[PDB]
Amino acid sequence: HEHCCSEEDHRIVQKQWDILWRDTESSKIKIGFGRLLLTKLAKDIPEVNDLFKRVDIEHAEGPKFSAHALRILNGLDLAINLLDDPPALDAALDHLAHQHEVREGVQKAHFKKFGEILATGLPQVLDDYDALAWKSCLKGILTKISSRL
Amino acid sequence: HEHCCSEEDHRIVQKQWDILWRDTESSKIKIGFGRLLLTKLAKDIPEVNDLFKRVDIEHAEGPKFSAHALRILNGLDLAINLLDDPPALDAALDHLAHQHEVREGVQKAHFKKFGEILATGLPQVLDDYDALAWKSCLKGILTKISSRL
Amino acid sequence: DCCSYEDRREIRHIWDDVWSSSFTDRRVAIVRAVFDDLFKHYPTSKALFERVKIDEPESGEFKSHLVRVANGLKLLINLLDDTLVLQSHLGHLADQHIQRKGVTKEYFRGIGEAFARVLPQVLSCFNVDAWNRCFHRLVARIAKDLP
Amino acid sequence: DCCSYEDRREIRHIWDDVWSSSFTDRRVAIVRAVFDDLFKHYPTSKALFERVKIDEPESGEFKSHLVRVANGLKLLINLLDDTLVLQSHLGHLADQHIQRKGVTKEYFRGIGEAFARVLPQVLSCFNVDAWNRCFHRLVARIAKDLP
Amino acid sequence: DCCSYEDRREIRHIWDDVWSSSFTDRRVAIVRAVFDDLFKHYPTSKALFERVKIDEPESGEFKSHLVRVANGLKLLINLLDDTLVLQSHLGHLADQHIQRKGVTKEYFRGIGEAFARVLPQVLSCFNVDAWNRCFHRLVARIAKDLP
Amino acid sequence: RIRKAGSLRHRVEELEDPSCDEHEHQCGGDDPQCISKLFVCDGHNDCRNGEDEKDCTLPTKAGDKFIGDVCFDHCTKRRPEHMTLAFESSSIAAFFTPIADLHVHIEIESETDEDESEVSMPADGEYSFADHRLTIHPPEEDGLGLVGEFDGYNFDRFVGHIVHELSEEVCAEFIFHRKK
Amino acid sequence: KKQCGVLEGLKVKSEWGRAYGSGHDREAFSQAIWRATFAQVPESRSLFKRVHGDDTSHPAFIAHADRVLGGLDIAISTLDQPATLKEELDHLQVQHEGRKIPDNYFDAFKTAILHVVAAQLGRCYDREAWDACIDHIEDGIKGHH
Amino acid sequence: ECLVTESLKVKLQWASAFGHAHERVAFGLELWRDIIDDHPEIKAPFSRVRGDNIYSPEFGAHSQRVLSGLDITISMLDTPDMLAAQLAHLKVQHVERNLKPEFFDIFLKHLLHVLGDRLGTHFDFGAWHDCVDQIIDGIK
Amino acid sequence: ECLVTESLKVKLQWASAFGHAHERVAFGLELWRDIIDDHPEIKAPFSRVRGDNIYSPEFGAHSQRVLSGLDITISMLDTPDMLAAQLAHLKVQHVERNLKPEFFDIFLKHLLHVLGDRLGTHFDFGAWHDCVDQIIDGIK
Amino acid sequence: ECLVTESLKVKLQWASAFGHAHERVAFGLELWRDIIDDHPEIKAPFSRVRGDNIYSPEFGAHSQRVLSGLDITISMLDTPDMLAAQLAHLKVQHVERNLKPEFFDIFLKHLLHVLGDRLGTHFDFGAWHDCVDQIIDGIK
Amino acid sequence: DEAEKIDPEHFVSEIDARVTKIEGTHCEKRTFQCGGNEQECISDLLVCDGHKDCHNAHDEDPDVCDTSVVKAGNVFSGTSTWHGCLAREDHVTRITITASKRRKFFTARIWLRALVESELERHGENVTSSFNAKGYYNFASRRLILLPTDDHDDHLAVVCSFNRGDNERAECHRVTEATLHQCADLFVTLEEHD
Amino acid sequence: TIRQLKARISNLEEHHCDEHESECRGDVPECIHDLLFCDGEKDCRDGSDEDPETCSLNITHVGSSYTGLATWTSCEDLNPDHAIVTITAAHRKSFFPNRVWLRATLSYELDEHDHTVSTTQLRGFYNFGKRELLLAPLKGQSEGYGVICDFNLGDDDHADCKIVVPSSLFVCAHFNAQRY
Known part of the structure; x- marks a missing residue:
């Protein structure tokens, strides 16, 4: 209810997250942004580089990774776009939990960090950003995704 | 006759006189303003000081007078607020005439002066002032109040 | 006397028609036609404008x-909504006529009749009527000063 | 926890009433009445304001x-819509109290109770509740710096 | 002849889609695809752009x-509502091509066909059609000095 | 009496910022509910009410001829007095109620300066269920198309706007009457 | 009940500002109040026989009404600051002393005011507060301390 | 002198720009403010008409009187016999007093700047410069 | 000092002009921008609050803190005992640091320029100049 | 250099600010006016394109041509291979001819001032300064 | 039997009201518009004296004053679509008037208590959130305001307006007191008593 | 009853025409200039005119009276009083589909008290296109007052009258009227 992620709250997030996909070259953006986001993660926590090894994170611009950049960044999209349908969003995220559960090496502390990074990044590409609303929602998402251990 | 003192005329006065009571501390204003108005009267015509002696005009800030400051200033309010109901306003003013008739010492020349003072004062507190409209109305009021003397 | 705001509005419109x-042609013929009526009634005043060469109409x-x-009148009317300023320029307009030796309080009441005709x-x-009312208030203050 | 946008709106209004x-007059009596409740409960803090002469109430x-x-609080509330700036001035507000020797983390939790009463x-x-919630978020960040 | 206003509006819109x-990416591929059609039909012109290194496509x-x-074209279209200015820059755009030795009146009629394809x-x-019409009016004047 | 009253209801349904969307369809009625125009007539029921399935009759028949009287033609050079609209064929997909596809011949009797010209341009088009709005995709390369929105039964009379299909700019209005 | 003192005053003083209003709202506000008063104690109409109390809509009375609220204004507006209030109350005290004015009517008139004010302010209005202050003001006029 | 069209153009644009009633005082004010901020040396001769406080009624009056005269000259322009006369008349009211000639060059600079805002891109700078100039020199 | 009316007038106009919430930040920003463009020498002491980038939150915060104090002073002024005290309090926060005296004369110039835009022709320049001035001197 | 974000930010804001059709001419005009009033020395080289009357079509055309190029550079900007090329191309159109160095520093000053108005407080001064600067030097 | 179901005289009335609903106020708010004869504005409280506000009087005529239609004790149901201040999915609300005091007469104002229920799903089966409310009905306002009593839930206040143009039907919104925002839209209809 | 609804409703949306053009009554929208009525003959193609709703008796009919409560911006110190503009005579001939050119009287109470009442005679016409009744003082009064009443609810009965000053046509007072 109050605790979790308000209608207005996400209605906001959703609106602000859309400022991004106004131009058809979403790929170039999603990639570049997701690329940077993951990079800046491996920067602060290297034990990550080995996890993303499978997707050739070594080559940031390498298609292998660029594709990945999308998948993840695009997953975040899914999460955000289902914010207005808790049961669905729930299911959608639970599924993401399982996709991370079987990937050993990935620990909670990783998400906590990725969250802080994401929160410092968004406001750099979006002129209109409501830190409070976002933090509220991103938390709920990141948590439910890593919930499965 | 009619045309002088018009619906539009007073509709204006009324509107402009309201710019004053926007904030709840009307007392502080009405007092200060009325205080000044009466003071500046005694300044130009001293035989007045003796009339307002009864209300301790000697102590401008003295409650005795401050109260008075209100009563008068507040009476002017009544006058203005009844401008849109001639019969009522009439009665309301006639009554004021009698309240001044039994106060010997008060002569017409006093009002004429008070009028000039009031006309020079209002425009100092009201950014939007229509001298023509006001003079027209203030005249009708001041006159009817002193006519009986 | 006083005049009424509605009346001012009436005039502020009536004027927009004259x-x-x-530019000049029209306003000229009118203001002229006004004076011609002033002179036909108070011939005396005529002399006052030798400075501007009235002997040479065109x-x-x-x-x-x-x-x-004309424009001075225009300026007045177009000030009827800004009272305070009108009240000042109205004075200034008097002084410009008080220093004009030979201008009576009468000649004014005379030009007033002029327009009204x-x-x-x-x-x-x-x-x-509306015109007359507000015109008088304007004249009174102009004329009055001189005395 | 966090602050909802609705809550912010609630406050952005509640404040407009205090x-x-x-006039100073009003805000004064209120902020005062607040402190009087802080001192009646945490009398120790009183001493901290000898610099401003609390011994001379008027x-x-x-x-x-x-x-x-008061105004410092006003500034806070009137910043609730500009998060990023609030987050900074909120820090600056801490530092202004950390350098004030004698200010405990407690005294703050105490003034918080004050307003709520x-x-x-x-x-x-x-x-x-709404007030309490967002006031705590504000206090937490202020106080915390100090210890 | 002069171009119909409706048609201009049509284009002022059609363009907003290309x-x-x-981004550069899009406009590039299009303008390129346009030239590739100019060169496949009037191969002679190719040589004219060695100055910009056409031998190195990327x-x-x-x-x-x-x-x-592209932008030069954009500038044109986005001027269709300011005639007088268009008429001037349109000239200036000619002069920039007259001083480019080797540019025929033909190559232009050729790039015109290009877009239309x-x-x-x-x-x-x-x-x-609408495009063709207003594009010709633009081209004609651009050549226009040149020959 | 029914239609006459229902007709009145419509006039009202038109007033106002509308319950449903332009796109969306208002089920009714006692309790509102908004569903997509695409959305009815799925064959699943949207409506408690059951609107998506009770409106027994398809507005769109077949074979009908409609005569349009011009009244505002920026659009053509000749401006014609009239404009006949003959419906050749009409078929609904077995799965889709919502949209019925049409094939129409737009006939025209103009007088040219020189001679007299006659025309019968053929064009495809569909009729949407809820909208009562038939869109006749432009016969022409030019992409002048017709868009008539019904009252529907009442009246088979429909205002026909000729527009630039892409723009949806209106530039010609004709009142079309069903020829019996 | 609520204590009287500073705050409850500020509240009434403020709310009164909204309820009193001006122009016609006023000419009515008063109208409504008196109608409510007389409806409660028709007996009291006899006191305002001098100012056409028989017809609440007669200019004479309209004036009277608008004139009465006037004082009430001064009262409330001054009221919370003691210095001034003191004066207004004292002033009233005089206009009343010499007469005896039974507490039954004042009661009704208060009720009237309260009901109308409540009708005028819609939602933001503290009853106890007004009751307390209108009382303090009335006491100062009856001067049965 | 100026071209018969180059006048009508100004006579016309002046209309839209200047305006009526209050719209004018606003114009006058905006004008003089920009002028005085650029060259505070002017607050000097405007001492009689409270030039220190341009928002004052005293100055406001003045402001208007000025623009009015400008109106005359401009509507004067169109017909040469009246303009030539009007201009000559203005020159006299000035010559006597001493002024600095450059002040007018300033006044003009702004009058154009302002009309620029009011009229937009349609503003026929050429016409005005050529035309209002002819009114300034005459006075000076 | 002020007059009693000359204050209320400012106290009142300040209300409309300054505004509430965001409307303020906008004001502050517009103000400081005009100030810094006129005298870039100021970007110096504002080094602590990123004065190079006035759009930054760091400076934005500052901007607000400033205006707020100005609000206080303006509110203060009517009641003398509070003003005299408040002013004395401000003098201290300034005396210690070295500053340019003329900076304030600048600040004032713009604060009026801005309020001028916000308030329009109603803006009582007189009242403000006479009144805000008194606030600057005490500080300085 | 610049940052990839610091570009996208400008690329984006340029969009809203510049605008489309007439909205642009208005921008260009407003820009050049402010520039020429500040440094009339520029009316000199703009002699070919009637720089005396910026409202003229001749100049108007120019104005646009300019902004357009600025659009290109900005649009080039993000992706290095195109920028490096575009910049080099601009350098040539300039080197040949005399221009003052400082003129561009001026142009930039205003371009930012104007975008400031258009965009408001959101205007990312930092991003622009860092980014448009790079465009000026190269051509320069 | 079929004939009793379609009253024409009823249907026509639906259209009248339906249309009258389309046909703003000239008057100022919380003012009362008189009848055909003149055209005048009257302040609300004053106009519903309970005694005739005006000469004519608009009020006095029996058609408006008529208690019965107005009278509470009705149950109103309908769907409450949320902006989602509340966590919970869309659903139905059921406002039912518990009690209603006035004077004996007493037209203007009707004080009343009522029961507000919703039928929403928790984890597990269908539940029903009921809270008790107190409030009033404003004859003139054509408004019914229901605030929560002292409940720990303190579920937010409902507000309904008349002019549907049916009497039966009303347009409601859930709102907070303090905020006095609109959290949700709710269109109710009186359920048949039988 | 239904008839009265369709009416009340119909009287109240725009019409295409810019001023002093009116549409032909019938099926076609088409707009013709107000003036051309009458040829005597059908100006219109449609001949919508010839239809009774245009040539009607009642419409033209003289001695229709409209009243409402006049609330004077200007004059009336007192409490807004009853205004009554009633038609005293209006020219027909025989054929004449069209608008009368007419004479009426404007009466408004001095007071309730006084029990007196001003009655000025007027002259003027009725604009078909405008739906507007325009009357002015007949003469010779030199101050007489006049009145403008707009039809266009679409209704008959109802009009938006405003007492003006026959000079400038400036609104002295306004009163929403009904018939009687």
Whole structure:
């Protein structure tokens, strides 16, 4: 209810997250942004580089990774776009939990960090950003995704 | 006759006189303003000081007078607020005439002066002032109040 | 006397019908026609304008004058919504006539009659009374100073 | 936890009822009434304000203080819509209290209780909870710096 | 003859679909695809752009060129509502091509055909005729000095 | 009496910022509910009410001829007095109620300066269920198309706007009457 | 009940500002109040026989009404600051002393005011507060301390 | 002198720009403010008409009187016989007093700047410069 | 000092002009921008609050803090005991640091320029100049 | 250099600010006016394109041509291979001819001032300064 | 039997009201518009004296004053679509008037208590959230305001307006007191008593 | 009853025409200039005119009276009083589909008290296109007052009258009227 992620709250997030996909070259953006986001993660926590090894994170611009950049960044999209349908969003995220559960090496502390990074990044590409609303929602998402251990 | 003192005329006065009571501390204003108005009267015509002696005009800030400051200033309010109901306003003013008739010492020349003072004062507190409209109305009021003397 | 805001509005419109032409031709003929009525009634005043060459009607030295008079009136009317300023320029307009030796309080009451006889002929729907009322208030203050 | 946008709106209004008038008078009496409740409960803190002369309630050297406190709070609330700036000034507000030797993390939790007891008396329709929530978020960040 | 206003509006819109985002990527591929059709038909012209290194398609020295061309067209279209200015820059645009030794009146009629074959493929709802009409008026004047 | 009253209801349904969307369809009625125009007539029921399935009759028949009287033609050079609209064929997909596809011949009797010209341009088009709005995709390369929105039964009379299909700019209005 | 003192005053003083209003709202506000008063104690109409109390809509009375609220204004507006209030109350005290004025009517008139004010302010209005202050003001006029 | 069209153009644009009633005082004010901020040396001769406080009624009056005269000259322009006369008349009211000639060059600079805002891109700078100039020199 | 009316007038106009919430930040920003463009020498002491980038939150915060104090002073002024105290309090926060005296004369120039835009022709320049001035001197 | 974000930010804001059709001419005009009033020395080289009357079509055309190029550079900007090329191309169109160095520093000053108005407080001064600067030097 | 179901005289009335609903106020708010004869504005409280506000009087005529239609004790149901201040999915609300005091007469104002229920799903089966409310009905306002009593839930206040143009039907919104925002839209209809 | 609804409703949306053009009554929208009525003959193609709703008796009919409560911006110190503009005579001939050119009287109470009442005679016409009744003082009064009443609810009965000053046509007072 109050605790979790308000209608207005996400209605906001959703609106602000859309400022991004106004131009058809979403790929170039999603990639570049997701690329940077993951990079800046491996920067602060290297034990990550080995996890993303499978997707050739070594080559940031390498298609292998660029594709990945999308998948993840695009997953975040899914999460955000289902914010207005808790049961669905729930299911959608639970599924993401399982996709991370079987990937050993990935620990909670990783998400906590990725969250802080994401929160410092968004406001750099979006002129209109409501830190409070976002933090509220991103938390709920990141948590439910890593919930499965 | 009619045309002088018009619906539009007073509709204006009324509107402009309201710019004053926007904030709840009307007392502080009405007092200060009325205080000044009466003071500046005694300044130009001293035989007045003796009339307002009864209300301790000697102590401008003295409650005795401050109260008075209100009563008068507040009476002017009544006058203005009844401008849109001639019969009522009439009665309301006639009554004021009698309240001044039994106060010997008060002569017409006093009002004429008070009028000039009031006309020079209002425009100092009201950014939007229509001298023509006001003079027209203030005249009708001041006159009817002193006519009986 | 006082006048009424509605009346001002009435005039602020009535004028827009006489003024209205952009430039000089019209306003000239009207202001002229006004004076011609002033002179036909108070011939004396005529002499007062030798400075502008009234003996040469089409002079231009005089036409320009007529315009200045017209425009001076225009300026007044177009000030009726800004009271305080009107009240000042109205004074300034007096002083400009007090220093003009030979200008009586009468000549003014005379030019007032003038308009009241001319205007009703140059345009229809002229509220002679409304005009008269506000014109008097204007004249009184102009004239009054001189005495 | 966090602050909802609705709650912010609630406060952005609740405040407009305490602040409202241009006058010091009101805000003063309120902020004062708040401190009087802080001192009646955590009397130790009283001493901290000898610099502003609390021993002279009507001093003016002190009244002005009260106002600064009030206004400092006002500034906070009136920043709730600009997060990023609030987050910074909120820090700056901490530093101004960390360098004030003698200010405990407790005294803050104490002034918080103060408002929650005062405000509900100076105005009706006070969402004590909503206030409490966002006030804590504000205090937490202020205080924390100190220890 | 002069171009119909409706048609201009048609184009002022049709263009907004090809120009599109502020991105180079898109506009590039289109303007390129346009030239490739000019060269496949009037191969002679190819040589004219050695200055910008057409031998290096992905050069960038060339890509930038393509863009300038694109933008130059954009500037034209986005001027169709300010006639007088268009008429001037349209001239200036001619002079920039007259001093370019080797540019025929033909090559232009050729690039005109180019768009009319490309555009209808990059976007739907293309009023080929309307485009053709106003594009010719633009080209004619650009040549126009030159020959 | 029914239609006459229902007709009145419509006039009202038109007033106001509308319950449903332009796109969306208002089920009714006692309790509102908004569903997509695409959305009815799925064959699943949207409506408690059951609107998506009770409106027994398809507005769109077949074979009908409609005569349009011009009244505002920026659009053509000749401006014609009239404009006949003959419906050749009409078929609904077995799965889709919502949209019925049409094939129409737009006939025209103009007088040219020189001679007299006659025309019978053929064009495809559909009729949407809820909208009662038939869109006749432009016969022409030019992409002048017709868009008539019904009252529907009442009246088979429909205002026909000629527009630039892409723009949806209106530039010609004709009142079309069903020829019996 | 609520204590009287500073705050409850500020509240009433403020709310009164909104309820009183001006122009016609006023000419009515008063109208409504008196109608409510007389409806409660028709007996009291006899006191305002001098100012056409028989017809609440007669200019004479309209004036009277608008004139009465006037004082009430001064009262409330001054009221919370003691210095001034003191004066207004004292002033009233005089206009009343010499007469005896039974507490039954004042009661009704208060009720009237309260009901109308409540009708005028809609939602933001503290009853106890007004009751307390209108009382303090009335006491100052009956001067049965 | 100026071209018969180059005048009508100004006579016309002046209309839209200047305006009526209050719209004018606003114009006058905006004008003089920009002028005085650029060259505070002017607050000097405007001492009689409270030039220190341009928002004052005293100055406001003045402001208007000025623009009015400008109106005359402009509507004067169109017909040469009246303009030539009017201009000559203005020159006299000035020559006597001493002024600095450059002040007018300043006044003009702004009058154009302002009309620029009011009229937009349609503003026929050429016409005005050529035309209002002819009114300034005459006075000076 | 002020007059009693000359204050209320400012106290009142300040209300409309300054505004509430965001409307303020906008004001502050507009103000400081005009100030810094006129005298870039100021970007110096504002080094602590990123004065190079006035759009930054760091400076934005500052901007607000400033205006707020100005609000206080303006509110203060009517009641003398509080003003005299408040002013004295401000003098201290300034005396210690070295500053340019003329900076304030600048600040004032713009604060009026801005309020001028916000308030329009109603803006009582007189009242403000006479009144805000008194606030600057005490500080300085 | 610049940052990839610091570009996208400008690329984006340029969009809203510049605008489309007439909205642009208005921008260009407003820009050049402010520039020429500040440094009339520029009316010199703009002699070919009637720089005396910026409202003229001749100049108007120019104005646009300019902004357009600025659009290109900005649009080039993000992707290095195109920018490096575009910039080099601009350098040539300039080197040949005399221009002052400082003129561009001026142009930039205003371009930012104007975008400031258009975009408001959101205007990312930092991003622009860092980014448009790079465009000026190269051509320069 | 079929004939009793379609009253024409009823249907026509639906259209009248339906249309009258389309046909703003000239008057100022919380003012009362008189009848055909003149055209005047009257302040609300004053106009519903309970005694005739005006000469004519608009009020006095029996058609408006008529208690019965107005009278509470009705149950109103309908769907409450949320902006989602509340966590929970859309659903139905059921406002039912518990009690209603006035004077004996007493037209203007009707004080009343009522029961507000919703039928929403928790984890597990269908539940029903009921809270008790107190409030009033404003004859003139054509408004029914229901605030929560002292409940720990303190579920937010409902507000309904008349002019549907049916009497039966009303347009409601859930709102907070303090905020006095609109959290949700709710269109109710009186359920048949039988 | 239904008839009265369709009416009340119909009287109240725009019409295409810019001023002093009116549409032909019938099926076609088409707009013709107000003036051309009458040829005597059908100006219109449609001949919508010839239809009774245009040539009607009642419409033209003289001695229709409209009243409402006049609330004077200007004059009336007192409490807004009853205004009554009633038609005293209006020219027909025989054929004449069209608008009368007419004479009426404007009466408004001095007071309730006084029990007196001003009655000025007027002259003027009725604009078909405008739906507007325009009357002015007949003469010779030199101050007489006049009145403008707009039809266009679409209704008959109801009009938006405003007492003006026959000079400038400036609104002295306004009163929403009904018939009687």
